[model samples]
Target chain A: ACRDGLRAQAECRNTTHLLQRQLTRTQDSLLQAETQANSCNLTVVTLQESLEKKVSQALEQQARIKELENEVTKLNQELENLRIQKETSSTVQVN
Target chain B: CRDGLRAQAECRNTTHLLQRQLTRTQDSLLQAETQANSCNLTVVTLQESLEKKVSQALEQQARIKELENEVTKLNQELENLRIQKET
Candidate 1:
């Protein structure tokens, strides 16, 4: 019976040792996975912020470009009217 | 003999507890791994979209510059017409 107890104790010790190693490995894996998840989350946040900034800039530039085009159109009209006035003055001078 | 028997029983109890702990740890690890994988994919997708947004922003900047140059030219032409009228 003592011999049987000795053998059982040896088996239990072996099992416990293996469990310890397995637990250590699993804990390490969990740490790595959690770390990676946090890093990825931070990267996504930064990318989203940058994308938003770019979107705002693009929209503002688009609006500014529209205003510039409108100004150009008005300038063209004014130039045409001025030329007509000049032509009338020159023709009167000629007459 | 009895002491040896008691030691064996204690060893078995310790092993049982360790086994239970290991199982719980493994489960936690699996969950963490799954979440990490999903985050990895999210990062990749967000990066791709960001690249496209950057390209669009650059294109808009180029267009703005072109329009600004055109405005300068028109202003110069208007100035020239004014000079012609004065003369």
Candidate 2:
């Protein structure tokens, strides 16, 4: 009976140790997954910021182009008028 | 006394089996969590890439609008010049 008791005690100790090791491994894996999740969240934020900046830049460029177009139209009109006036004056001088 | 010894041995065997099962359960749970984490990461990456594409589309649209506006302005100016010449 004494020998059987000793064997039982040893088995209990071994089982407990195995359980502890398994739990530790699981905990470690959980920690790693949590860390990865955090990194992914950070990457999402960075991408959002970059996208916003690009969109803002595009809008600003559009506005500048609109202003340039208006200026070009005004200049072209002025040039046409001057040409027409110069032609009329030359015709009068010839007459 | 022999019966008591047999009982103790049976208890030990049961404990050993329980411990083994617990270990397998823990491992399975860990594997499941790892797979979930991988899926989450994939979703995040896809979302980021989608945002980049949207930004590019907005910029391209802006460029097109600018070109259209410039063309309209030029056409108007040319029309005015022709009218002045006619007058």
Candidate 3:
């Protein structure tokens, strides 16, 4: 009975040691994975913000281009009107 | 006899606690791995989208510059015509 008790106790100690080792390994992997997840999340947010800013700037640039084109068109019309007026004046002066 | 039974009982308690802790740690590890996978996927998608946005912004800048040049040319032409009319 003493011998049986000793062997059972030894089995218990062995199981405890194995569980401890497994727990340490699992804990390390958990920490490493958590760190990786956090870093990736930060990068995701940063990239999204940058992308939004770029899209906004591109839209503003498009609007500015439209305004400039409109100004050019208006200027062309004015130039044509001025040319007609100059021609009419020259004809009157010659007469 | 009573001593042996008590010793075995204590050992059972210790091992049971250890077993429970190991199970909980394994569960947490699995959860962390899943989260890491999801985060990586999001990072990749955002990176690709950012690249496209940056390229579009560059193209828009070039277009804006061209329009600005056109406006400048028209203004110069208008000024020259006005001077001729005055003369």
Candidate 4:
């Protein structure tokens, strides 16, 4: 009976050791998974910020393009008026 | 026999408890991963915007440079005309 109890105790110890090892492994895996999850969250937030920045930049660019277009139109109109004036003055002088 | 049945029930209960805990942890991890994905997307969008803005600024600078060259050429032409008149 003493030997049987000793064997049972050893078996119990072995089972406890195995359980502890399994728990440790599970905890480590959980931590690793959590870390990965946190990284993913951060990545998502970074992407959202990037999207907002891009939208703002695109709007600014559109505004700049419109402004440049207006400036070009105005310059073209001035050039045309100058050409007309030069032609009329030259005709008057010749006649 | 009754005590043996109670012990077996306790083991089952422990296993169930551990399983529930694992499930909860997995769910939480999934939530965290989703959030991280969003952050990555934000970073990408910001980078794209920076690139676009830089391009626009460069284009505008080029236009301004062209205007400056035109003004310089016109000034030179006017100076030449003045010299001719004096001669």
Candidate 5:
């Protein structure tokens, strides 16, 4: 009977007011969650970019090591040839 | 009084709609969070691999330097032997 001597109208008004408060709180929580999600996405992106670059660098390093080992093999082969030539000439000089 | 009662009913209905929307939004956000966790785990996995490669590469570089030095020594030894052959 608070409004126009009608009990139902007064009760309905009160219920609406209560729902408004709940809606405002829910909206606040949703806003906070959206902001938090953005931060989480940002972290993931930054990490992904950093890891990709390092992976490429690691691949390059592997290639470099392979090339180095190949060069070493070539050098050893050259040394072996030179030793054979030295031994042949020395034996000829002895004769 | 009739008009006032109608307005209050409308407010409750709109509030109910908003509550449903908030629940849906929360569910989607949780899914996004799960995806984020998976992405982060991969990053850590990659991070661990990078560390191992970097260490092995560093170790390999030191060995490569030593191998180059041996090659140089071999070249010099062969050069000195050639001089002996000529003399």
Candidate 6:
């Protein structure tokens, strides 16, 4: 039993040394990065926000285009009317 | 007595097993933390690339808006011209 205790004490000390060495190796940047991995949703959020903003901007451009199209329609009618009026007076002068 | 010798052998065996467990547990624990770090670096790289693309997409949005503004201004002048033609 006395020999056993002596051997056990050495084993205890060895285990302690090995445990501390591993702790020191792993507890630095490695452990910190593991913590960061748990909470970082940055990429997911950025993609989600990007999609929403892109869609909003796309819709705004479409809205602007639609307004311009309506104006174009109005101008087309006015130009057609002016040309018809000008041609009719010219035809009357010729007659 | 031989009883004391047997007890000593039993303790030595138990201690040896415990020592083995201690080393194995530490190694696997460290291995787990290293694997976690790999995943974190993957997340970091993907975030950087995604942010770069998002910024480009936003710039595209601004450029498209500028084009729309030009069309809006064109429609404005055409409206004015149509009014004068009415006169």
What TM-score fits each model? Answer: 0.81, 0.50, 0.82, 0.53, 0.64, 0.52
Worst 10 residues of 3 chain B by lDDT: B77-86
Candidate 1: deviation at residue A66, Å? Answer: 1.9
- Predicted candidate 6 versus true structure: per-residue lDDT over A1-69, tens digit per residue: 467756656665666667656556655545565565555545445655666676666567667656766
- Top-lDDT candidate index: 3
User: What is the C-alpha lDDT profile of model 1 across B1-87, one tens digit per residue?
Assistant: 788778878888888898898889989989998988998888889888888888988888888888888888989999987887659
Candidate 6 colliding pairs? none
TM-score ranking from best candidate downward = 3, 1, 5, 4, 6, 2
Docking class of 6: incorrect
Per DockQ, the best of the predicted structures is 3
Residue by residue across A5-77, what tens digits does model 2's lDDT show?
A: 6776677767767776776777677667666667766666776676676767666666766776677677667
**Window of ten residues with lowest summed lDDT in model 6 chain B:** B1-10
Pairs in steric clash, model 3? none
User: How would the docking of model 2 be graded?
Assistant: incorrect
lDDT of 4 by residue, A1-81 (tens): 356545545555555556556666666766776677677666666666666676676677667666766665665565566
Question: Which segments of candidate 2 are over 4 A away from where they belong?
Answer: A1-13, A90-95, B1-87
Q: Model 2 chain B — which ten-residue stretch has the worst lDDT?
A: B1-10
Scanning candidate 4 chain B in windows of ten residues, the lowest lDDT window is B1-10
* Model 4 lDDT tens row, B2-87: 54445555555666565666667667666666665665666676667667766766676666666656655555655565576549
* lDDT tens digits, residue span A9-55, model 3: 88988988899899899899889999998888888889888988988
Candidate 4 at residue A49, lDDT? 68
True contacts kept of 3: 0.80
lDDT of 5 by residue, A1-95 (tens): 54553665566667667766766776676666667667766766776676677667767766876776787787678778877876786564534
Candidate 4 vs candidate 6: the lDDT winner is: 6
Docking class of 3: medium
lDDT of 5: 0.69
lDDT of 6 at A18: 70
Q: What are the runs in model 1 whose C-alpha is more than 4 Å off?
A: A82-95, B1-5
Model 2, residue A86: distance off in Å is: 2.6
lDDT of 3 by residue, B51-70 (tens): 88889888888888888888
